Amino acid sequence: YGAIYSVSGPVVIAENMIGCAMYELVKVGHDNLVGEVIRIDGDKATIQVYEETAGLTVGDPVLRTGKPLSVELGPGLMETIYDGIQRPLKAIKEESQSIYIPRGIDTPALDRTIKWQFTPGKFQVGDHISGGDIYGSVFENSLISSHKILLPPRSRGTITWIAPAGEYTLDEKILEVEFDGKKSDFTLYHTWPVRVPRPVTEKLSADYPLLTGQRVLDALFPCVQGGTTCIPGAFGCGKTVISQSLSKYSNSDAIIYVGCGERGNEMAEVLMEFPELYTEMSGTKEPIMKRTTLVANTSNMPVAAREASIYTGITLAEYFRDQGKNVSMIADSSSRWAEALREISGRLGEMPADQGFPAYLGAKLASFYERAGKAVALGSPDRTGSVSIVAAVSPAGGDFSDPVTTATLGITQVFWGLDKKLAQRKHFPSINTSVSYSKYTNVLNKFYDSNYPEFPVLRDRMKEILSNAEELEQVVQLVGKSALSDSDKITLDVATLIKEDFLQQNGYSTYDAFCPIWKTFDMMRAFISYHDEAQKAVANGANWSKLADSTGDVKHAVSSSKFFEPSRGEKEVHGEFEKLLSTMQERFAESTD
Amino acid sequence: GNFKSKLKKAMLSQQITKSTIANKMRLKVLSAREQSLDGIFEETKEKLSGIANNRDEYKPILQSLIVEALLKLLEPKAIVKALERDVDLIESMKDDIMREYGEKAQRAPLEEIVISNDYLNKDLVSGGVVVSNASDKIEINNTLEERLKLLSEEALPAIRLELYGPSKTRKF
Amino acid sequence: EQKNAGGVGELEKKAEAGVQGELAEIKKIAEKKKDDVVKILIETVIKPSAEVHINA
Amino acid sequence: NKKAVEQGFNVKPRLNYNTVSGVNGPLVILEKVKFPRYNEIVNLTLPDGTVRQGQVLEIRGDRAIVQVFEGTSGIDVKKTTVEFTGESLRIPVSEDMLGRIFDGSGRPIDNGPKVFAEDYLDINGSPINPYARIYPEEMISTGVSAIDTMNSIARGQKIPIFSASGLPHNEIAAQICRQAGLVRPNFSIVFAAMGVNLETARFFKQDFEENGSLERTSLFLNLANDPTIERIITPRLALTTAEYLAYQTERHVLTILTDMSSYADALREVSAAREEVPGRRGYPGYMYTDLSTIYERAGRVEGRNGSITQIPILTMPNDDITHPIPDLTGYITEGQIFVDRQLHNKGIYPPINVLPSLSRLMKSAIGEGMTRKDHGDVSNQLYAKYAIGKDAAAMKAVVGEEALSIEDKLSLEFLEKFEKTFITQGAYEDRTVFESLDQAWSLLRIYPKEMLNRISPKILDEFY
Amino acid sequence: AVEQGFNVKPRLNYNTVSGVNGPLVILEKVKFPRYNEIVNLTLPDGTVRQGQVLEIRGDRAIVQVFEGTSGIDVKKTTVEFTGESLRIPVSEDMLGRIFDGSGRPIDNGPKVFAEDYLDINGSPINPYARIYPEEMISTGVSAIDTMNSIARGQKIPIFSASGLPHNEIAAQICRQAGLVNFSIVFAAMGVNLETARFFKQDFEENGSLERTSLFLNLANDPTIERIITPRLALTTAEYLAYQTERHVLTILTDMSSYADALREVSAAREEVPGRRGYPGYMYTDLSTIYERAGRVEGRNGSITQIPILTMPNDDITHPIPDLTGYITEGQIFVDRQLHNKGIYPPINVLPSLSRLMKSAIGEGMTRKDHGDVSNQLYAKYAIGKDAAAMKAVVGEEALSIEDKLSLEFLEKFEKTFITQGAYEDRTVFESLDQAWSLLRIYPKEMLNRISPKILDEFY
Numbered sequence A: 001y002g003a004i005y006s007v008s009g010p011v012v013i014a015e016n017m018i019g020c021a022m023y024e025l026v027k028v029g030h031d032n033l034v035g036e037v038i039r040i041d042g043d044k045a046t047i048q049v050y051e052e053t054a055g056l057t058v059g060d061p062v063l064r065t066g067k068p069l070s071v072e073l074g075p076g077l078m079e080t081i082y083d084g085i086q087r088p089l090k091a092i093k094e095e096s097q098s099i100y101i102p103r104g105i106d107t108p109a110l111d112r113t114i115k116w117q118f119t120p121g122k123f124q125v126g127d128h129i130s131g132g133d134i135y136g137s138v139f140e141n142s143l144i145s146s147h148k149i150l151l152p153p154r155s156r157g158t159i160t161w162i163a164p165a166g167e168y169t170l171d172e173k174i175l176e177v178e179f180d181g182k183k184s185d186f187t188l189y190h191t192w193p194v195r196v197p198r199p200v201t202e203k204l205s206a207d208y209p210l211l212t213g214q215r216v217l218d219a220l221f222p223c224v225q226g227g228t229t230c231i232p233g234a235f236g237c238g239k240t241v242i243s244q245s246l247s248k249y250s251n252s253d254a255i256i257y258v259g260c261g262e263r264g265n266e267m268a269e270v271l272m273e274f275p276e277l278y279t280e281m282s283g284t285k286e287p288i289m290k291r292t293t294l295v296a297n298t299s300n301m302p303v304a305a306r307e308a309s310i311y312t313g314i315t316l317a318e319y320f321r322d323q324g325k326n327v328s329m330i331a332d333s334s335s336r337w338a339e340a341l342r343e344i345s346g347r348l349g350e351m352p353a354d355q356g357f358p359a360y361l362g363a364k365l366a367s368f369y370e371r372a373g374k375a376v377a378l379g380s381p382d383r384t385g386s387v388s389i390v391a392a393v394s395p396a397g398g399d400f401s402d403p404v405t406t407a408t409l410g411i412t413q414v415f416w417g418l419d420k421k422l423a424q425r426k427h428f429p430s431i432n433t434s435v436s437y438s439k440y441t442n443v444l445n446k447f448y449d450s451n452y453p454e455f456p457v458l459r460d461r462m463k464e465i466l467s468n469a470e471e472l473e474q475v476v477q478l479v480g481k482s483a484l485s486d487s488d489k490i491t492l493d494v495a496t497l498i499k500e501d502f503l504q505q506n507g508y509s510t511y512d513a514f515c516p517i518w519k520t521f522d523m524m525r526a527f528i529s530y531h532d533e534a535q536k537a538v539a540n541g542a543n544w545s546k547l548a549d550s551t552g553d554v555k556h557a558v559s560s561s562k563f564f565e566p567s568r569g570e571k572e573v574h575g576e577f578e579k580l581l582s583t584m585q586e587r588f589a590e591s592t593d
Numbered sequence B: 001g002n003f004k005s006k007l008k009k010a011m012l013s014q015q016i017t018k019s020t021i022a023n024k025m026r027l028k029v030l031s032a033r034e035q036s037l038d039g040i041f042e043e044t045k046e047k048l049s050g051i052a053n054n055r056d057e058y059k060p061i062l063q064s065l066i067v068e069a070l071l072k073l074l075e076p077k078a079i080v081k082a083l084e085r086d087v088d089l090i091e092s093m094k095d096d097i098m099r100e101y102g103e104k105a106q107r108a109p110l111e112e113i114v115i116s117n118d119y120l121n122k123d124l125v126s127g128g129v130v131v132s133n134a135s136d137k138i139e140i141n142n143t144l145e146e147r148l149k150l151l152s153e154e155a156l157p158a159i160r161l162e163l164y165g166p167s168k169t170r171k172f
Numbered sequence C: 001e002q003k004n005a006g007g008v009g010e011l012e013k014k015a016e017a018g019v020q021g022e023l024a025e026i027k028k029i030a031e032k033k034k035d036d037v038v039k040i041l042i043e044t045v046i047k048p049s050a051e052v053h054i055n056a
Numbered sequence D: 001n002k003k004a005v006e007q008g009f010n011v012k013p014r015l016n017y018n019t020v021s022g023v024n025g026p027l028v029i030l031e032k033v034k035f036p037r038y039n040e041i042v043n044l045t046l047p048d049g050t051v052r053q054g055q056v057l058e059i060r061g062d063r064a065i066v067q068v069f070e071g072t073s074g075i076d077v078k079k080t081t082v083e084f085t086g087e088s089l090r091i092p093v094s095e096d097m098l099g100r101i102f103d104g105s106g107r108p109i110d111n112g113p114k115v116f117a118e119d120y121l122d123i124n125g126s127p128i129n130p131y132a133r134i135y136p137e138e139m140i141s142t143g144v145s146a147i148d149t150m151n152s153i154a155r156g157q158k159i160p161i162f163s164a165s166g167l168p169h170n171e172i173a174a175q176i177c178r179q180a181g182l183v184r185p186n187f188s189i190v191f192a193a194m195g196v197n198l199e200t201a202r203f204f205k206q207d208f209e210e211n212g213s214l215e216r217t218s219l220f221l222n223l224a225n226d227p228t229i230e231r232i233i234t235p236r237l238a239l240t241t242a243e244y245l246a247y248q249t250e251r252h253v254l255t256i257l258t259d260m261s262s263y264a265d266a267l268r269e270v271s272a273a274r275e276e277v278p279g280r281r282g283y284p285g286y287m288y289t290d291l292s293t294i295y296e297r298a299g300r301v302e303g304r305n306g307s308i309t310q311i312p313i314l315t316m317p318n319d320d321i322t323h324p325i326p327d328l329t330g331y332i333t334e335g336q337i338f339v340d341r342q343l344h345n346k347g348i349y350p351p352i353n354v355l356p357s358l359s360r361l362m363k364s365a366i367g368e369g370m371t372r373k374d375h376g377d378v379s380n381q382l383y384a385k386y387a388i389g390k391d392a393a394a395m396k397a398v399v400g401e402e403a404l405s406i407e408d409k410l411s412l413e414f415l416e417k418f419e420k421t422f423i424t425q426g427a428y429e430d431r432t433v434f435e436s437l438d439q440a441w442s443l444l445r446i447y448p449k450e451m452l453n454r455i456s457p458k459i460l461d462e463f464y
Numbered sequence E: 001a002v003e004q005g006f007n008v009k010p011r012l013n014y015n016t017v018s019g020v021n022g023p024l025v026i027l028e029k030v031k032f033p034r035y036n037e038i039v040n041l042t043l044p045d046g047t048v049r050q051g052q053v054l055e056i057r058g059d060r061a062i063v064q065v066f067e068g069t070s071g072i073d074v075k076k077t078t079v080e081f082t083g084e085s086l087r088i089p090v091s092e093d094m095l096g097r098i099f100d101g102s103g104r105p106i107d108n109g110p111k112v113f114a115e116d117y118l119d120i121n122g123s124p125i126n127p128y129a130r131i132y133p134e135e136m137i138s139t140g141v142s143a144i145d146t147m148n149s150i151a152r153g154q155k156i157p158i159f160s161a162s163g164l165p166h167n168e169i170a171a172q173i174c175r176q177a178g179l180v181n182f183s184i185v186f187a188a189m190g191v192n193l194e195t196a197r198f199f200k201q202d203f204e205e206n207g208s209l210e211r212t213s214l215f216l217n218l219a220n221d222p223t224i225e226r227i228i229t230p231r232l233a234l235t236t237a238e239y240l241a242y243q244t245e246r247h248v249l250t251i252l253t254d255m256s257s258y259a260d261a262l263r264e265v266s267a268a269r270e271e272v273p274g275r276r277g278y279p280g281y282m283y284t285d286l287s288t289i290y291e292r293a294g295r296v297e298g299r300n301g302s303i304t305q306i307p308i309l310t311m312p313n314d315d316i317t318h319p320i321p322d323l324t325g326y327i328t329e330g331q332i333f334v335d336r337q338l339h340n341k342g343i344y345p346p347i348n349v350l351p352s353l354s355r356l357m358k359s360a361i362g363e364g365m366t367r368k369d370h371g372d373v374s375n376q377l378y379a380k381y382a383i384g385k386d387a388a389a390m391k392a393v394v395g396e397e398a399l400s401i402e403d404k405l406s407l408e409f410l411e412k413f414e415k416t417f418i419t420q421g422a423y424e425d426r427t428v429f430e431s432l433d434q435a436w437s438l439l440r441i442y443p444k445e446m447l448n449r450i451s452p453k454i455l456d457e458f459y
């Protein structure tokens, strides 16, 4: 045990500490505040503390734990909210009987008292069991049922005693591996260093789309299950709402929401809203909250804990991928992680990179975003999980030229750049279609050919319409609409209709909270057909000025197609869209006759 | 066009599997050289293990191995870690080792040489010593096993030129 | 694609057959030069040099 | 019963250090300190007798870097006695604060007695447990239509007022402070004037008395002439008093933190003294967390009927949203009420520009029984038509009114009768949310039902 | 004949680690520390991480650790001073393999059976011994082979912003980089696994994996061995090209990530920083990397260097692209605006330049009209951009007849000449014919930059 020697915000240079390793976990202070070592200079080892350092006194003992920052994985992870360090907020509140996070609470990461229905896997006594093999499944909840208990990735050997089926607490031994004569006892939970990525057999190309349920996203800039995503944009653009509408209705099996430097009321909103929504997956109306775990490190909670929250979230997502679940980790305000790194570097005195950030920010972000990606799990049986990272980079001042935004665009394959100007007009989700891109469009051809064959053709056609009308509107804003031709006027009107009735998706509304892939494809077909048939009609000789008044009914029916509630069923909404297309064709035929 | 594209994809698949079939066989040749080379070092390790058995022939080698590492340390006092089977030899060789270090390094003779009781693992080390500084913070893994490991690391081109002729491609 | 898949095993067997000569040549070279290389390595490992650092 | 107070019914001696080993800027570096405590309020005793407080900032072994709130002007090495209180800064809080006027540091300046403390609370506060937080769904009938119907204010909302140098942020913030009331059932108020000029201080201290709020408002007035660093602890003191009131005596507090740009400037002028990482525009890198520590002390908590609303008035320099203060305030807070220089020049009061204004607690507290069912759709439709009108006004200023289409002309008419008959409002004229929605519908009835592309068909049928 | 030494040099193990911070490990009492030495830090867990001595004092040695300093204990880490700079074991059998960032293999193959231990830093080539490369390679890309032509031995990077298809362009160049049998060495530098797998897949599909050696340093790999990866790849390339008389096409992707690694290492040394925080000597470091191209007087071999580069914010003024332009011979500029407009390859030939086109252009090398056609295309494209700006600012009607022709040429040039599908391999002659079909839009009077003796013969 060393002693504190200097405290300056969230850095505690602790003297008499010969023997501490880099990124080792220490218990700084009498309250046993959790801290990690980041720099060593002889005896004095500079510690960043994941807790309020106020009140620390020189000479306060600091204990070297002997193990890097480790997150406990196993049953009980789901349907709980955690702090930056792996601490349950519910357990902390009930232990402290207060509404504040006390300094130095050491509640167990996973509820030990709750007993789980363990049912042993295919492995029998004597069979060689390698890292990551599944030796049993616990019934976590009605939705994440069969929470398959993996062996620790570094563990290997032959089974000596596997527990029979029954009810077990986490502290209860479940399996004992004999390896080279040294028996090791394994339980339902295993710790894991957050910095070290969980091993996988082999990563795979992510060929299945993460259906966000939002028309603009999954119709113009798709994200695949296992693809890094970035959502830059100023305050109020809608990064948090896109993240929440993704974690509420995506096709991901399990979700690890990470509020790294977010607002407290946002996490409270998630806590009260997720139990009130039900996912149609698993053949029942099970609540969303049974599949989401939350890592809430709000903005005012300790600066250093933001990095711990990000790494804990990604490690939970990696564990649930190794189980075989299509996880979708969501790092809310990933720029707050960069700001935490900048603050800690400023405390350390390290030389800055561009704009105050440390020189290693790009490397840390790259190593974090490389954790994502579909990959075959480590051991038998064959499992194909996936982690999709959707992190909301928050630029300083709204300009995408921020170092965190550039270092995130260099690594992420998707870029859902938000526009503050579109955000102000309540044009939501305010996706800036000019700069946003998705590098997974080529990969998703193998899925769009199997389902919805015309989807890519419609996507490029609508991107063409939007780009052409954006350029035309840019010209018109300085040269007037006098010189526009009839075809150009149709392009302008059609793209305005697209922006105001298809791209815009009013979340927190009954009809357009979740526009799934089939309704999105049908609406997309309706809009594209309207544009194509209007252009054909004007080419046939019909004047656009008269055609607008003649087909206002068709235009309003198209714009009102977004009001078709998806809950009516795929067959019903598809039928309504077929009827709308027939009515549109008949109306244009009558007008052009 | 989709059928033509699929045929092109299948054709490129044939090239992909044709290379990986040849690459796997090509790496079978490379693994054969390393495995046989490992046999050379496997045979060498056993032969050096027999050197320590012949205490008469191994006697002055040990005095050289201690001195060859003492001259690198240049510390006035040193700690010599040796096997359980060589402490007796070193207890008699120390007097000459002190003078030999004094002469070769052209400095004052060693102040004190101490055979530490932390004997080397007899199963992994066949001979030699691990000479350390006075405080045991700076040391030299001058054992026969480590010596052969260093030779294996730093001599591979010479073993290649011995086992095989120089590569016909390598000119200039 | 099925026709190409069927030929993979035949291609693998043909590749394995051609390599087997190289493995035989490697084994012969190893057996021929094993004594010489072992002698050189042993003579190098034993009989150490003893020279202080050139800058000392 | 209350045995917690008895545990602190003890005496603890304090060490007086005449060991000042130097001083540079606002930082006093001590030496020979006996086990320095990081962030411990320290009472310096100047040679002239003046007593200046200060809190430790860095405790390199047997040395403490004490920053003094009132400035180091006059600190001598061989005469100042630096006395360690051994505990972080604490304000003596009680239910008797309500109705008193405090200085920047909490020392009363109303010629009244010292606060008969019910408890001492660390001014830094503690992060409220996000599991204990409650999402504020109780909307406040603010009275100003531009806020009640668009960018709505919930109870635990922390919605700042963004305004330029000369805009009437104080007048609007006083109107919100005097008319705020729950729509479907008063607010205790806590004030924190940071760097305001005496005119603004007297305006608030007189408006509260005029409306009778002063019987339940505690003012923390840190004017321009007050020490610059005291503005760092003034908002923490105000929010600690408000946290006590709300979360312990179960009151509804409406915290107002005037001139938050002055607090940000105090942060910059302190960080630049410590040569810290310069973030952007010179503000320290950690200013996000420094402002978050302030703003996040708001919102309702589980099991307690209290609630802290925040309206931190902000003075944007050069009326730029991209400036670090308004940018980070927008990221941290849950809305903003953008007071517009262009609107103020046009003569509209309140000069609220709804387009940059936002409220993240308006997706809740709208619809069903909280307000009329048309609120959520009508606000969005008003935003859409206001933006269309602004774009068409720009197009008109460029090319001429002849090229404006029928929709553009309708947008111009809507924008005119919107800015001049819906945003505009008397200073003492409060409009219920239902009346504001009725006026909004009267504006919307300019368009035919077809052009209202945002209102749901059911809402159109029932209300248009 | 060949000469080699069976020599065993015992290595000093130092447990005297003083302190560790960032990527640097500071030792305390090394005996005669050697600069640019390679050390093996034995962690308390037993794992061994290589290092490299960056600076020495009387007894100190500021070791940078390639595999990161996580888990290094000041009381149980033992540093083993090897006694020589970083030497890669090369062989003619190294072709067709895959290696990690630090030179260790990734594929299931064994350790490379050494043929020579080459110092990775290399040795300076005598400028008197360098042959000026005047043998153009027909890269197949129209915008490169026609207007920014590459000569065999030229170090020409691909300046592409974040998210642009520079990987696709470089894979295309590798696939169809014949002359008007290239061995390839690849140095992945923090590229994501998607990009690395795409490069590996392309090299396998085009049959190149039989004659290519990849040095993959993924984004998951440690961020300091990005300083050894270019040197390892380039010393392999130098070995093959010079001492095997082979032709090598080196692809050093993400030199921006290499410079980020240099910044991370330099900022931990508290060195005086250059622009944007990059080290002052970063010009010299990037020069030591890039300047290892070119043919040699004796050995029939060439390292045609194509270091892909990620200019942040799509800016040339940024230090990495600026110094890469200073060192390398021109650049291939990939344009975000063109990519958004949908062109592939999105090469913007206005910032693009090839310093050896002036010699490998034509007049008996490729075609008589090559140089004049390229100059005419570049001039008319600049005129087209100017005309587009003028039309956007002051209306299209105000544009002159020449400006309108320039706009039509710009459209038909971006949409039909630069625009080419991947796996399309138009020869330089086909590229010149398409260029002429573009230039015939203009009348013969408005083609002033074309020499009349070629205009009258090709119009």
Ligand SMILES: Nc1ncnc2c1ncn2[C@@H]1O[C@H](COP(=O)(O)OP(=O)(O)O)[C@@H](O)[C@H]1O
Binding pocket: A233, A234, A235, A236, A237, A238, A239, A240, A241, A242, A428, A429, A505, A506, A507, A508, D331, D359, D360, D361, D362, D363
């Ligand atoms: N898709 C959407 N549908 C409806 N409202 C939205 C949508 N996206 C954002 N919002 C609005 O934006 C506000 C929240 O924005 P948020 O995502 O928190 O931005 P930021 O993360 O920059 O603060 C909410 O008040 C909500 O009404």
